[PDB]
Amino acid sequence: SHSMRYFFTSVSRPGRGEPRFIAVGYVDDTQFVRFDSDAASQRMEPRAPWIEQEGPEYWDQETRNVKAQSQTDRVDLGTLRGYYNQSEAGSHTIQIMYGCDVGSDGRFLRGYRQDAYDGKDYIALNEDLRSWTAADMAAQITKRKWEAAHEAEQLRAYLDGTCVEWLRRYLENGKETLQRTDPPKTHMTHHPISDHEATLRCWALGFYPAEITLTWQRDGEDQTQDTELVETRPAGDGTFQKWAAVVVPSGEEQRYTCHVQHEGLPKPLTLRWELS
Amino acid sequence: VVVGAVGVGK
Amino acid sequence: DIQMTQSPSSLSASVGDRVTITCRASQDVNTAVAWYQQKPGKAPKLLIYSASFLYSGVPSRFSGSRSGTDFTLTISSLQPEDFATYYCQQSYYYFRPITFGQGTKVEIKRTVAAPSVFIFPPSDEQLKSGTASVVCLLNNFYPREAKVQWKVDNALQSGNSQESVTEQDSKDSTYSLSSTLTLSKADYEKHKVYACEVTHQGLSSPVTKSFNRG
Amino acid sequence: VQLVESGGGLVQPGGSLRLSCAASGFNLSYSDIHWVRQAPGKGLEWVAVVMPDSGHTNYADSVKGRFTISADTSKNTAYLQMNSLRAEDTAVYYCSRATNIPVYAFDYWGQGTLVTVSSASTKGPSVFPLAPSSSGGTAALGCLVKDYFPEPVTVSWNSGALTSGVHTFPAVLQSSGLYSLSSVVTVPSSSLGTQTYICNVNHKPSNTKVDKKVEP
Amino acid sequence: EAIQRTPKIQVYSRHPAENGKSNFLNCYVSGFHPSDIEVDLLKNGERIEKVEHSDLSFSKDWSFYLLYYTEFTPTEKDEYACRVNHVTLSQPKIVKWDRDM
């Protein structure tokens, strides 16, 4: 399966300028476009080599589009902040997702559009691509406007036709970049707190897709209460990483194994702590 | 590709 | 501040005459302004909206264009049934229209005719008015720069007089103006000789006509 | 999200009062009525910036006291009040009753009115025809009516049979303080010879209606 | 108005750090809401200036990532830190680079 997401952050930055607007776009975890409203240019600067190929018309109309989106956010940062009656001159964000999944064969699967005001939820789209789950007494007003004017209809047309066809095009273009799985190299060691108790840590390094599960198999069961784990860490260079840890008495460490499962990993791996 | 049309305001 | 300057154009749409209208600002936009017809004497209307995404009314033959830099912002007008005072209205920081432009003009070009003035002394009810309104009838002339003469007292009546205007008649692409003046009953009676000289852009000479009574 | 308008051609607010417009079609209820106001050749965004809901119904007010926040998204999206009868009481207030997207048709409006530059219940008209001197080229026999409201009229000629050739005339303020307009009619000489001329004027604000007869 | 989630600062080297090599000093300030971070990469206390960052993403629960990063060389004298401030941290928290962690 594959997806294509468009995150559209818009911080209201009042008084000291003009609403910032970063409009990242993603494909399956990797970024290929960007747009800061304060940078070198006012362009969809490319962010991945396989989109350089597109050519001047593409960048022109993509820039026109994303500046239209930026305009839309700077319009509705004065309506969300108007019904959530919210005190002119205070920072207050808007966030917007899009998407369209496909099958491994390239057939459309699901379409999702999700909006968020200050950190919480707002209107979102169903999985039948036909109605709107307002998540507040403001997203009520939004969904009424979107059920009227059939924004759902236009959006579904976009999603299936345009979003799916360009997604397949991108995966054609990036076929040497996106259709890859990075099997996490596994590494792990212990930090002795004292001569009676210690910690163990299990390292997931270099895996592209941001989905992976680390489990410490404590002698047949996962010691889920003693799982200190960190979030997914962007390794800066497109890959990812994460670790989880547990507190262990000395000697007992031989009763724990780290079990991990990733798309790049056919057989889930066992980490047996080398006593030395 | 970003949504082509000017979308409805939120 | 914010100052929307209208950099206009006019005078020519006969059947297909292409026209470009531009507007200037004292602020900086991203890719847009707003555009707005205003049909003569009735019915304001959206027109082309912005730049980098135009969106058009049902008269979808125009083009409104980006300037990037605010040299101007521009519109293209073509046909002659679309004669309205166009306005340039404010984008980039989305103020729901806060600062208008000031006004341009577009008309169909039939003949750029000189004014036709034929003198009518007003009937005896004009003294029943209590004010003298000697009528310089104006016919089939381009918008009035003709210096029609108010020889109601046989002297120019500018400012003290009032004038009730006539719009361009659509058929001839020109006004048919009638001059209505509120001076006095005594002014009409004291002077009986009435002429309307017409110095004009079309008419350099102060062309004068004499009525014959009855 | 494309809509309609309302409001009425309000008459003399010579006592301080209120005006209203009302939506249709879809309910905007979030971003909606705007009440932009204009004078002959300008345009101003007074009270009732986004009013129905989304609050602060004076984003960019820059006026207060008499221009009043009145209504909301009850499907009839504002009822604005003047509190003025002499100063700046002459605009044509409007309603951006489609404001729904940054880029879709803003089906504004069609109406909104004033008192007049003059005030206090204009007097009854006076009707004055104009008789041609003679007739060269265009031949026109004028009809002028004076001392009433700015509001437009209906004029009847040839005993009301022939409305062709008549001139519809707007009114401007005069020394009288009473608005006046005329109906000059053009008749071809052959038609001018054959048919006798009748002028009839009908101004509802005037409340008096007169028929005027001219004979060659 | 918001929930003002507190940053989850994580200072780390995008490669397994080695003595005297060319790494990056990532300061992956994970889900913080209000979005105006003030990450500083401290070179034994004084702010480095030649630091850039990835774009402002966010997450399924609407919590922004950022990945402030810059080149450095791991030397056993300097205590690389990451002075992460925020509208929630009422002190310029000095989460350090625990190379061992």
Residue numbers in the entry:
A (entry chain A): 2 to 277
B (entry chain C): 7 to 16
C (entry chain L): 1 to 214
D (entry chain H): 2 to 135, 140 to 221
E (entry chain B): 19 to 119
Reproduce passages from the article.
Mutation associated neoantigens (MANAs) are products of genetic alterations, making them highly specific therapeutic targets. MANAs are HLA-presented (pHLA) peptides derived from intracellular mutant proteins that are otherwise inaccessible to antibody-based therapeutics. The most common KRAS mutations occur at codon 12, where the wild-type glycine residue is mutated to a valine (G12V), cysteine (G12C) or aspartate (G12D) residue. We previously reported the discovery of a bispecific antibody, termed V2, which can specifically bind to the KRASG12V-HLA-A*03:01 neoantigen and drive T-cell-mediated killing of KRASG12V-containing cancer cells without non-specific activity against wild-type KRAS or other codon 12 mutations.
Specifically, we determine a TCR mimic (TCRm) antibody bound to its MANA target, the KRASG12V peptide presented by HLA-A*03:01. The cryo-EM complex structure revealed that the V2-Fab sits on top of the KRASG12V-HLA-A*03:01 binding groove in a partially parallel orientation, leaning heavily towards the C-terminus of the KRASG12V peptide and α1 of HLA-A*03:01. The total buried surface area of the V2-Fab/KRASG12V-HLA-A*03:01 was 1388 Å2, with the variable domain of the heavy chain contributing to ~25% more than the variable light chain (862 Å2 and 526 Å2, respectively). Overall, the V2-Fab made a total of 149 contacts with the HLA-A*03:01, mediated by five of the six CDRs, all three in the variable light chain, CDRH1, and CDRH2 of the heavy chain. By contrast, only three V2-Fab CDRs (CDRH1, CDRH3 and CDRL2) interacted with the KRASG12V peptide, making 26 contacts (14.9% of all contacts), all of which are hydrophobic in nature. The V2-Fab engaged the site of the mutation, Val12, with a loose hydrophobic cage consisting of residues Pro103H3, Val104H3, Tyr105H3, and Phe53L2. Specifically, Pro103H3 sat in the small groove of the peptide, Val104H3 sat directly on top for valine-valine contact, and Tyr105H3 was positioned directly over the core of Val12G12V, pointing towards α2 of HLA-A*03:01. The site of mutation, Val12G12V, was pointing up, toward α1 in the HLA-A*03:01 binding groove. Moreover, the binding of the V2-Fab had pushed the C-terminus of the peptide, and particularly residue Lys16, deeper into the binding pocket (rmsd 2.13 Å).
